[PDB]
Design a protein around this ligand. Sequence first.
Ligand SMILES: [Mg+2]
Ligand SMILES: [Mg+2]
Ligand SMILES: [Mg+2]
Ligand SMILES: [Mg+2]
Ligand SMILES: [Mg+2]
Ligand SMILES: [Mg+2]
Ligand SMILES: [Mg+2]
Ligand SMILES: [Mg+2]
Ligand SMILES: [Mg+2]
Ligand SMILES: [Mg+2]
Ligand SMILES: [Mg+2]
Ligand SMILES: [Mg+2]
Ligand SMILES: [Mg+2]
Lengths: 157, 207, 49, 259
Amino acid sequence: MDTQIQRAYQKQDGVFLNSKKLLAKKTSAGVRYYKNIGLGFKTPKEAIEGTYVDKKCPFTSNLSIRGKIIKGLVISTKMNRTVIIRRDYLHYVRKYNRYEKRHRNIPVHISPCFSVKEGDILVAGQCRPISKTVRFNALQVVPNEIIGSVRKQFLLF
Amino acid sequence: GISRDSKHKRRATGGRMPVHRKKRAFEKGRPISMTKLTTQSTTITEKRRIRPVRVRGGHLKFRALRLCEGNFSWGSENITRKTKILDVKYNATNNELVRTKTLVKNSIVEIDSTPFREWYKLHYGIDLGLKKDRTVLGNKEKSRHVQKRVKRTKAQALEKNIEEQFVSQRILACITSRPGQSGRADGYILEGKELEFYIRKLQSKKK
Amino acid sequence: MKFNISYPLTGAQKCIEIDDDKKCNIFMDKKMGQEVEGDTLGDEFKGYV
Amino acid sequence: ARGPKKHLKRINAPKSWMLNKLGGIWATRPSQGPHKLRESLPLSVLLKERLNYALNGRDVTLILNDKEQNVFVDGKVRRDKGYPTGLMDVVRIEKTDQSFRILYDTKGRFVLKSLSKEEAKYKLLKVTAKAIGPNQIPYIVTHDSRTIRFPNPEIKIGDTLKYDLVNNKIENFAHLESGNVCYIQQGNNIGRVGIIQHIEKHQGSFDICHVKDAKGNAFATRLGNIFVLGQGKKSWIELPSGDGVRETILEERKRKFSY
RNA sequence: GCGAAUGGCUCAUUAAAACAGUUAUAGUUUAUUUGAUAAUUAAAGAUUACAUGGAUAACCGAGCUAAUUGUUGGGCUAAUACA
RNA sequence: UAACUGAUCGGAUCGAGGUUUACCUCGAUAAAUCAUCUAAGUUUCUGCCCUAUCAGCUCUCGAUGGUAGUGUAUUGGACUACCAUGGCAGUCACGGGUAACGGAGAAUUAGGGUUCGAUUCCGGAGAAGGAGCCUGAGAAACGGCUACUACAACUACGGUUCGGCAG
Ligand SMILES: [Mg+2]
Ligand SMILES: [Mg+2]
Ligand SMILES: [Mg+2]
Ligand SMILES: [Mg+2]
Ligand SMILES: [Mg+2]
Ligand SMILES: [Mg+2]
Ligand SMILES: [Mg+2]
Ligand SMILES: [Mg+2]
Ligand SMILES: [Mg+2]
Ligand SMILES: [Mg+2]
Ligand SMILES: [Mg+2]
Ligand SMILES: [Mg+2]
Ligand SMILES: [Mg+2]
């Protein structure tokens, strides 16, 4: 009644079981879409016993992950199940023979399963284009503490 | 040349974005194809109309413009018969599509219980016509009629909502097919989770 | 108005020049392939269609 | 771009063809076939510049168009100026009953190996993909774009088969595993032949492999570039330029002019 | 029936755009080629399969305009066209 | 397994060489699906010259994300509707200049650098400017078409052009 309607006008799964399950009145009916992107990645416990209907998830959908895999710090928590990760790298300068600092910002999609927080390191995978920016989904989240400015924070992670 | 190139946009940082390429033909964008219903030939004689469009590879893609009959499946029973759709209600996407009884992939509609009624009768010995005459079996109980029982006893507890539906002649179901893409209109019969829910949208919608 | 009159049945191709105005007056405001009553040509065309 | 390319430039045509730089301006562009553009040798190249049976361009035009049929590729007739003869193929020159192996050098140039009516029978096939198709049936596919029906089941995807052309029959296969012999179809290391050491898969999208050989050199290349020339040390075909092993510019000198 | 969407010229536009070096297509289309695969022709209809049906260029002949690889208009027969 | 459409396919075609029969042998070509080759869309990451006498930019319609649909060859706010308010920035956003198409490379060079790359390779863009489209497996083609702006050629001034040399 909550996870289902909640504003939006319906939220099923990829494997349209449900209502039909009432046919198997004895074993386990409460099926949800289960998956495992593999690639050396554990599938979130929370992902399984959730009521969430996120088609853009890498464990609850026919969303693949291929090639490019990222690790970066998180900037913002706003946006619906989407986050911006900031990567901090050095650039070399041919002439002066030294480096300068630089940061690329990245649009990342977050399946409800893992719980966000601002200023923590995150691991993204290469998933098909989900929107103008998005092209990365979160696969493994590590909580971390930064006392204040996320901008000030710059780590060659 | 209604294109869909992502160039006429503004990069992340909303700054306008350059162009050196005239609209290129592979960015094709075909004219939308609203899809109505002939469950009211008050004007509309030609029941269903489907126009085929020459697509890329060289294939054809049939486009549904006007319809009246689609195919639907009862999840639970695994039955599927072609039936006449009735009126479109609640399109979610927008209420105007309902106002023009347009057919979106996921538009919730009504159908004729006839094929399902006809079937539920033959396989269980239960017509579903007004409750009292409920069952209709055979005179002698020695032979194969012993099965309509076995099935009937399968506590065919078809939700109190599924039952009312039949008798009323109307049946709730959502669609699962792009008319503007394949020309057809196929849907599943509404039940449990969504049934209860979509109905609510309808109860509260009118009240 | 000059006429290129063809005769199916045999394969007769003939050309007639009709200068006087009064005769042709019947072809005016008639559609393509209509039925012509070639009696507005009392000459050689006595009772033709 | 306008549509699909359709020509090829002297300058741009692969160094494997040991081509004439001054030559002309173009070069026979391989026809869409069994082997990829870069990995192939169009007949015109094969006879004119290679064998030298042909010469001027029209010379070919005769040979492959003449109602006699002078060229055979894997037991079949061919009459296309640029049929892409690829790796591990067998080409027969009718009018002389010549039989050749389409194999790369040790320096990566397409070489023509002369075969005896014996090897001319079998051809080595590498396994592309393996899956079951229509009505419960198993299918295997070879680099040579061969599609196989009902193949022996003890065959993993990255296998190497011996093919009896005469009977279009298979015999003695051999997967790639620690301890075999191999030929590398392309790379900074092509034309080499050694003993597989071990295959470290990295799944992230690209597995690698190591190798040893005669002078016990250490070789490194991606699996896609390994072709199993044989099982357990014994190679299956005669190699060009002696054994599939290249020399230091230093070893070449000492062998030739003995420095 | 294919080809004409290769090539050939040019750089006016165009600063993360295009490009390059990289990667993905489990988000896709590809005529021509190479390998392979098909026992059942759907219902209603209709029905010959030793195999069906109708029409039109070229051609014959009449014609228009000052004018162009313009084209009207009548008669004749074939297809891997069409049906 | 259930049913839907039936505009998917399942050859009404063509050679030649043989040979006392019953035919035989090697080919052409049409065409469906899977591969395959070829190429193309779109895509990840990283990298560009001057400039703040450019500091706040994008958001009335998309600017950032979520929902459902359209649409496409397919992904996608690519477009519609509803919802959230985000997305970028001094680690220079946004805007402006460029006698700026980017590379491969070119000229001089102790080392480090300085200045160029219209121009045989590659990729891109375009064909008078601009938009639209037919056809096709394939182009917004352009030595194809439609209209507008500015033009080029013929005229019996009615009308016409297979009119675009950045080949
Ligand atoms: Mg510090
Ligand atoms: Mg096709
Ligand atoms: Mg060719
Ligand atoms: Mg892979
Ligand atoms: Mg970029
Ligand atoms: Mg005629
Ligand atoms: Mg004969
Ligand atoms: Mg969608
Ligand atoms: Mg600018
Ligand atoms: Mg420059
Ligand atoms: Mg060029
Ligand atoms: Mg490119
Ligand atoms: Mg000139």
